[PDB]
């Protein structure tokens, strides 16, 4: 592994498609290596932007647009933040000669569940939920037919719970198909059953020069699709983290290319269950900012640069809380920070531009003695801050 | 504690006052809270200006340049990494109502070994060196006689051992004046009595609106101006660490204002001398980029916005060792990275632009079950990086 300095003739180029919070934290990791980072977002003063060397503001689902970009800097890789770009471009460049993190083929079949989940249950012949694929209404209504009741329809190409359904009664179809038709790309569904499992967990899986190693089980709180709470490690059985972790490494290996994956996974007793995997770090492992040695972040950064990982260092209970309040705003302030921050505990703050709604504008962190502990001294902490608008 | 955010018309401006390797850490950690970043010096494309908001180019030293980015930018903030700054200015500035951080005093005192020797033992009656100050060949003869052999002349106005001579006879005292007018404003000496410690550390010492806190002693070992590697925790007796937190308790406060200063002590078994103190992060303090959960600039950081530090977490055994390479170049790459990195191993790379002759382009930093283990973990490390250009 060869690094350049940034900004001089040799540097070594990373391109962010997509410039959130995550993005920024490997924007971070990336210069902290002197590796020159090239920020890109559809909108200007993203997170990850404000940290960049520079920037560019384009339509990421334009594929014309990405080629121009790339072809404008030529990067020697290509870090997708989040699903929703033109990824039939990045099979072209990558088909091309550009190294798209983990691999083009990883983006292409996650940013689509019928391609993700045949491979993990048909190919791979892994456990996840009942399902069925259905392209029309009649079909849907069939399809719940034959999933039954409760059960969660979901557009092939959504994300944040976006244009997806948690069904009951049949009441709701009307409104279910529509619903799904709306979000995504606005025509196909997934209908799964509902697991009944203890609880969710997000395997960080990192796919490296060394092969793969995992971090610890990372335990969360989701509500109304967005995540509220993370902690490490959650408790499970060895049996348990045993299957779990088989599961993420034969996900991993099957979507090819290093980086860190986020492996989410469902648990009922020592029985684990696929639900779904992100080629790149998760919301949820923003609890790895404090957790660990390395975060996430570090550990993507290190993977796809070709150098081994080693170990994962594990700091005790350790969560993170989100900061999503809900306004209307293009120059929010932060008060009572002094009352967030202390021993063991921290407060990240994003640099979004604006908020029209419901937003997460930073995060909190905390350890503890125990993972409750620290799940209520996180959550307090983010409780605490004022959001104004 | 209201913090607005960055780029928008509330924000929280710092202006960075040398954008060095230590100042590209602090501005990290400004970004991680939405902060935003003016960085300043007296080269483009420095490493602070890396991860900066915007960056400008001037005379830091030329009060009146000072004043006119002061007045163009309106930071809230101003942080100074080093002591060659316009000092006059920012007290006049501070008084105009601006935060100069720790305060314009403890930069004014600090920028010139006279202003800080006299007050520590002379006003404070801190244990230091006997010392003489001489701005003449022959009172600088003189003073040495005093003084006696060894010795050791140094410019007043200096840093990384720049112009300094240990002298142990009459035969050097030629060369050593004539090299002592080499380093600084090119003047004045200080002739200092040899002490001799056991081992020398820097206690970083965060003044914050909750109090005055200490991190973990760190030892360090200094060759030829630059300190090589760096440990933590060093041992010492109790009530050595008790002598050395009352003379930086002391000597913090008396120098005023929220920051992380790094004050340096010589430990001679249960006694302590002060020796010189930096009015923020100290390099040897790199050593917490690994070996605790807040490092050394994100205190900083979070003592001078006002925020209450509350603890310091400490991980154990842990070490940093330079990568001080000596070229001539404008196109510094590094290789072999892959066996730089791995567990309880890490690297960071400056982003320094150019180089000609030695200079600190990065450090290795690793963590162990002991401090011998982590240092030579660290020394290996920045050795297998194949520094070219
Ligand atoms: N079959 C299933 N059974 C039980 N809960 C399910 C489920 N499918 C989804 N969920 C719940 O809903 C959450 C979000 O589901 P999903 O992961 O499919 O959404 P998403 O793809 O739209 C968002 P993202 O890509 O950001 O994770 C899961 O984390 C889980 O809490
Ligand atoms: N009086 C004294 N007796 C014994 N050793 C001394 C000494 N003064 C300095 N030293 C040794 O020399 C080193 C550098 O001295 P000093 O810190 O004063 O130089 P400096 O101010 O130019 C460097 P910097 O500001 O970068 O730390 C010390 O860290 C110590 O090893
Ligand atoms: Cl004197
Ligand atoms: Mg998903
Ligand atoms: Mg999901
Ligand atoms: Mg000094
Ligand atoms: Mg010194
Ligand atoms: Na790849
Ligand atoms: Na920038
Ligand atoms: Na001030």
């Given at each position: 592994?060869?690094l350049?300095?940034a900004?001089?003739?040799?540097?070594?180029?990373?391109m962010?498609?997509?410039?959130?919070?995550l993005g920024?934290?490997v924007?971070?990791?990336?210069?902290?290596?002197?590796?020159?980072?090239?920020?890109?977002?559809?909108?200007?003063?993203?997170?990850?932007?404000?940290?960049?060397?520079?920037?560019?503001?384009?339509?990421?689902?334009?594929?014309?647009?990405?080629?121009?970009?790339v072809?404008?800097?030529?990067?020697?890789?290509?870090?997708?933040?989040?699903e929703?770009?033109?990824?039939?471009?990045?099979?072209?460049?990558?088909?091309?000669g550009?190294?798209?993190?983990?691999?083009?083929?990883?983006?292409?079949?996650t940013?689509?569940?019928?391609?993700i989940?045949?491979?993990?249950?048909?190919?791979?012949?892994?456990?996840?939920?009942?399902?069925?694929?259905?392209?029309?209404?009649?079909?849907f209504?069939?399809?719940?037919?034959?999933?039954?009741?409760p059960?969660?329809?979901?557009?092939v190409?959504?994300?944040?719970?976006?244009?997806?359904?948690?069904?009951?009664?049949?009441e709701?179809?009307?409104?279910?198909?529509?619903?799904?038709?709306?979000?995504?790309?606005?025509?196909?569904?997934?209908?799964?059953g509902?697991?009944?499992?203890?609880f969710?967990?997000?395997?960080?899986?990192?796919?490296?020069?060394d092969?793969?190693?995992?971090?610890?089980?990372?335990?969360?709180?989701?509500?109304?699709?967005d995540?509220?709470?993370?902690?490490?490690?959650?408790?499970?059985?060895?049996?348990?983290?045993?299957?779990?972790?088989?599961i993420?490494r034969?996900?991993?290996?099957?979507?090819?290319?290093?980086?860190?994956?986020g492996?989410?996974?469902?648990?009922?007793?020592?029985?684990?269950?696929?639900?779904?995997?992100?080629?790149?770090?998760?919301?949820?492992?923003?609890?790895?900012?404090?957790?660990?040695?390395?975060?996430?972040?570090?550990?993507?950064?290190?993977?796809?640069?070709?150098?081994?990982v080693?170990?994962?260092?594990?700091?005790?209970?350790a969560?993170?809380?989100?900061?999503?309040?809900?306004?209307?705003?293009?120059?929010?302030?932060?008060?009572?920070?002094?009352?967030?921050?202390?021993?063991?505990?921290?407060?990240?703050?994003?640099?979004?531009?604006?908020?029209?709604?419901?937003?997460?504008?930073?995060?909190?962190?905390?350890?503890?003695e125990?993972?409750?502990?620290?799940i209520?001294?996180?959550?307090?902490?983010?409780?605490?801050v004022?959001?104004?608008?």
């Amino acid at each position: 592994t060869l690094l350049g300095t940034a900004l001089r003739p040799a540097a070594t180029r990373v391109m962010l498609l997509g410039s959130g919070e995550l993005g920024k934290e490997v924007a971070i990791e990336c210069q902290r290596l002197g590796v020159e980072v090239i920020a890109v977002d559809r909108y200007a003063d993203a997170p990850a932007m404000h940290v960049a060397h520079r920037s560019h503001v384009i339509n990421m689902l334009d594929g014309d647009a990405l080629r121009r970009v790339v072809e404008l800097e030529k990067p020697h890789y290509i870090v997708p933040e989040i699903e929703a770009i033109a990824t039939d471009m990045l099979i072209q460049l990558e088909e091309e000669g550009l190294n798209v993190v983990p691999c083009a083929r990883a983006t292409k079949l996650t940013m689509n569940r019928e391609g993700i989940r045949r491979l993990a249950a048909e190919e791979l012949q892994l456990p996840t939920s009942t399902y069925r694929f259905a392209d029309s209404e009649s079909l849907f209504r069939e399809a719940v037919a034959d999933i039954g009741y409760p059960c969660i329809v979901k557009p092939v190409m959504s994300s944040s719970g976006k244009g997806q359904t948690f069904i009951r009664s049949a009441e709701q179809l009307a409104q279910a198909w529509k619903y799904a038709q709306q979000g995504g790309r606005a025509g196909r569904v997934i209908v799964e059953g509902v697991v009944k499992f203890d609880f969710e967990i997000t395997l960080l899986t990192v796919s490296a020069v060394d092969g793969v190693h995992f971090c610890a089980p990372v335990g969360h709180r989701q509500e109304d699709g967005d995540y509220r709470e993370s902690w490490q490690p959650q408790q499970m059985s060895p049996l348990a983290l045993e299957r779990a972790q088989e599961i993420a490494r034969k996900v991993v290996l099957a979507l090819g290319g290093y980086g860190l994956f986020g492996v989410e996974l469902f648990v009922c007793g020592d029985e684990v269950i696929f639900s779904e995997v992100s080629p790149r770090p998760h919301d949820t492992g923003m609890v790895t900012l404090i957790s660990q040695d390395l975060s996430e972040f570090a550990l993507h950064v290190r993977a796809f640069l070709g150098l081994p990982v080693g170990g994962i260092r594990q700091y005790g209970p350790a969560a993170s809380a989100v900061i999503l309040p809900q306004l209307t705003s293009q120059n929010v302030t932060f008060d009572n920070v002094q009352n967030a921050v202390g021993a063991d505990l921290q407060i990240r703050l994003f640099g979004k531009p604006e908020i029209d709604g419901s937003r997460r504008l930073g995060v909190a962190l905390a350890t503890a003695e125990s993972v409750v502990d620290a799940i209520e001294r996180a959550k307090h902490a983010a409780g605490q801050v004022k959001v104004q608008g």
